[PDB]
Amino acid sequence: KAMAGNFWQSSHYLQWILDKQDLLKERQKDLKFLSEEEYWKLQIFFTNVIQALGEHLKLRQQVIATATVYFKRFYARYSLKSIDPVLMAPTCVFLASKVEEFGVVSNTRLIAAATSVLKTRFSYAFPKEFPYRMNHILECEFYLLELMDCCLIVYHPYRPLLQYVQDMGQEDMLLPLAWRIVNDTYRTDLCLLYPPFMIALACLHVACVVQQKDARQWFAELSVDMEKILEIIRVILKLYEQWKNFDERKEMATILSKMPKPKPPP
Amino acid sequence: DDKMDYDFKVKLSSERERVEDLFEYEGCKVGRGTYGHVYKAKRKDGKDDKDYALKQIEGTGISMSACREIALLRELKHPNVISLQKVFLSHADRKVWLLFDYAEHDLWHIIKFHRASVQLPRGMVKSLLYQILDGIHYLHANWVLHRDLKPANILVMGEGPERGRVKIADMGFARLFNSPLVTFWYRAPELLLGARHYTKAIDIWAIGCIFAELLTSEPIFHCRQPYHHDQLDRIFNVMGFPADKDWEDIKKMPEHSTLMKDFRRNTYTNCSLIKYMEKHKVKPDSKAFHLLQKLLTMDPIKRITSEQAMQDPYFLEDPLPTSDVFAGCQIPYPKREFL
Ligand SMILES: CN(C)[C@H]1C[C@@]23CC[C@@]4(O2)C(=CC[C@]2(C)[C@@H](c5ccc6ccncc6c5)CC[C@H]24)C=C3[C@@H](O)[C@@H]1O
Numbered sequence: 001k002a003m004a005g006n007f008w009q010s011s012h013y014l015q016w017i018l019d020k021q022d023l024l025k026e027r028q029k030d031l032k033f034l035s036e037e038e039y040w041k042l043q044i045f046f047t048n049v050i051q052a053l054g055e056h057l058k059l060r061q062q063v064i065a066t067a068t069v070y071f072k073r074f075y076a077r078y079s080l081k082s083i084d085p086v087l088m089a090p091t092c093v094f095l096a097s098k099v100e101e102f103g104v105v106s107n108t109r110l111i112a113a114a115t116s117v118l119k120t121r122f123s124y125a126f127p128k129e130f131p132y133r134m135n136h137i138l139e140c141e142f143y144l145l146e147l148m149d150c151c152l153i154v155y156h157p158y159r160p161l162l163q164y165v166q167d168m169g170q171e172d173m174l175l176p177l178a179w180r181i182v183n184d185t186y187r188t189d190l191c192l193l194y195p196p197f198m199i200a201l202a203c204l205h206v207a208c209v210v211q212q213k214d215a216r217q218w219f220a221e222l223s224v225d226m227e228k229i230l231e232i233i234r235v236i237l238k239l240y241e242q243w244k245n246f247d248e249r250k251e252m253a254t255i256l257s258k259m260p261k262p263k264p265p266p
Numbered sequence: 267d268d269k270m271d272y273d274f275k276v277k278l279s280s281e282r283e284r285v286e287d288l289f290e291y292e293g294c295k296v297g298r299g300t301y302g303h304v305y306k307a308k309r310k311d312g313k314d315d316k317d318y319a320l321k322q323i324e325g326t327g328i329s330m331s332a333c334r335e336i337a338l339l340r341e342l343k344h345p346n347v348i349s350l351q352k353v354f355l356s357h358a359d360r361k362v363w364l365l366f367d368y369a370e371h372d373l374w375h376i377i378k379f380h381r382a383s384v385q386l387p388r389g390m391v392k393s394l395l396y397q398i399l400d401g402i403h404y405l406h407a408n409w410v411l412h413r414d415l416k417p418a419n420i421l422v423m424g425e426g427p428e429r430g431r432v433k434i435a436d437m438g439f440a441r442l443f444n445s446p447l448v449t450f451w452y453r454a455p456e457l458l459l460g461a462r463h464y465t466k467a468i469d470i471w472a473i474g475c476i477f478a479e480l481l482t483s484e485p486i487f488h489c490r491q492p493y494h495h496d497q498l499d500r501i502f503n504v505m506g507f508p509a510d511k512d513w514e515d516i517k518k519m520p521e522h523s524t525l526m527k528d529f530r531r532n533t534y535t536n537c538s539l540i541k542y543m544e545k546h547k548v549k550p551d552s553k554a555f556h557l558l559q560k561l562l563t564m565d566p567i568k569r570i571t572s573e574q575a576m577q578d579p580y581f582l583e584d585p586l587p588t589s590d591v592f593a594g595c596q597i598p599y600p601k602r603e604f605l
Pocket residue numbers: 296297298299304319366367368369370372374375418419421435
């Protein structure tokens with residue numbers, strides 16, 4: 001796959017690994033309307049929306065992941081009021097599918113998927129039908145591309161995870177769970193803050209702890225900053241407590257009504 | 267959009283750099299093709315006096331070709347590959363513009379100037395080949411195929427800081443499922459036999475073709491206007507017909523039984539790369555020739571890689587390749603005519 005060994009000279013590494021404090025300062029704009037708690041709940045929710053759009057379109061996890069990252073990059077800089085995240089989400093899938101060499105997903109099919117997924121899987125959050133046409137997707141796509149400074153190649157933890165479990169010789173034991181935990185990390189800021197192989201390593205550590213697999217020695221033989229790995233582990237562990245305590249289905253309509261609203265023209 | 271924030275929208279519209287305010291390019295068109303429209307441009311604020319190339323991509327919006335060309339060029343950084351400097355998204359007409367440093371020359375025009383007569387100097391030919399190989403190795407190491415290598419896509423910089431440096435341009439953006447299924451002169455036999463994917467070896471074949479064209483000033487597999495019979499006939503008139511032992515997996519190619527129906531080994535019995543190149547006054551005991559032959563190997567699995575070709579002793583024989591393909595000598599090739 002294109003650019004696989006080039007992470008260290010990549011636009012992802014050089015432009016889109018962010019300072020955590022810079023991230024939170026830009027987030028203060030939106031925190032006048034939403035609590036910290038409600039902001040992370042929106043992020044989880046739209047992560048699930050993108051997942052559902054992706055599954056419905058029969059795209060691979062990597063396409064969904066790239067789409068998810070585009071959505072996060074945009075709202076890392078800009079307010080939730082700037083473009084409707086209900087529009088941005090299917091725009092991010094659409095653009096990602098063209099990068100990742102699957103195809104220009106039919107317009108009628110993109111619009112049908114968004115309509116169908118919100119209706120069937122997300123009616124708790126949305127009473128009204130998906131109201132955007134393709135010309136809105138097309139407009140949004142230009143704004144998305146401009147904001148990301150045309151940075152489209154994104155690197156994810158799946159590839160290094162696979163190399164690590166092959167190395168361990170435990171692809172059967174740990175890969176299913178570790179992969180699932182990598183999926184779950186997309187519910188957080190981790191992909192904006194850490195190189196992918198580090199998220200891979202943290203997910204694999206947790207998978208081993210969940211399955212009572214002793215990998216101390218294998219992890220000890222890595223030449224990696226273990227404090228950063230532990231930071232990632234903590235965020236994963238807190239994510240599962242957040243998940244336990246969150247009823248997405250009962251809370252999201254209310255939280256979506258608290259979002260700041262795109263100002264109309266005068 | 268009516269449900270997009272007005273303040274955000276007008277802020278961005280105010281700050282958005284538009285191609286037509288930044289650049290003077292009216293009536294300065296240098297290329298028109300399947301790539302789109304390429305202009306020689308100047309910055310309107312006289313900050314720098316450099317020449318730029320402005321490409322308007324064919325079509326509107328973000329097509330696959332457009333999307334992937336932007337994606338890759340945004341990441342790729344090597345002296346022998348053309349650098350994307352900037353991207354302009356024109357919101358009104360939905361056109362994408364790309365900005366590059368302007369390459370005064372290219373191998374289509376350089377070779378055609380030599381063919382208008384003076385055969386290409388031997389120093390310059392080796393340096394061209396070395397830089398094409400360097401650029402392709404970088405792409406290939408990153409799992410990026412060109413998929414359309416030919417002289418017109420080998421740019422060469424003119425007077426300025428990068429005098430005589432190759433810039434590989436217009437990578438085969440894009441191909442659905444990485445699949446090929448009017449120029450056929452640079453296409454490997456396996457494509458002509460219905461190969462279902464592009465490969466590193468296919469690029470390497472094109473490079474051999476180019477190298478032969480630099481040494482002779484003639485396209486080695488020149489032919490008239492997937493499976494093209496006459497193009498294959500020309501390859502065999504140059505190379506000979508491959509024996510079973512030379513390309514064992516030829517039987518696996520989808521068009522193999524068609525090849526057997528249409529062609530007989532015995533037609534090409536006194537035909538070989540040796541005899542072709544001797545007629546164009548290139549010695550078969552030269553390191554040039556031996557390198558050329560490894561590049562023009564019929565069976566893709568027996569073609570050398572870009573890295574092996576860079577290690578070839580041809581590049582250690584006098585004269586050494588140079589960073590400036592023109593070797594400090596005056597450039598006799600005319601500048602690009604406008605359209
Ligand atoms: C129609 N024929 C006369 C040939 C015309 C030609 C020669 C060079 C070229 O037009 C080109 C491709 C792109 C070129 C080189 C343009 C180009 C394209 C991209 C550039 C980027 C940076 N700097 C300069 C650049 C110039 C200028 C002329 C075009 C390809 C061809 C051949 O296919 C035709 O048979």
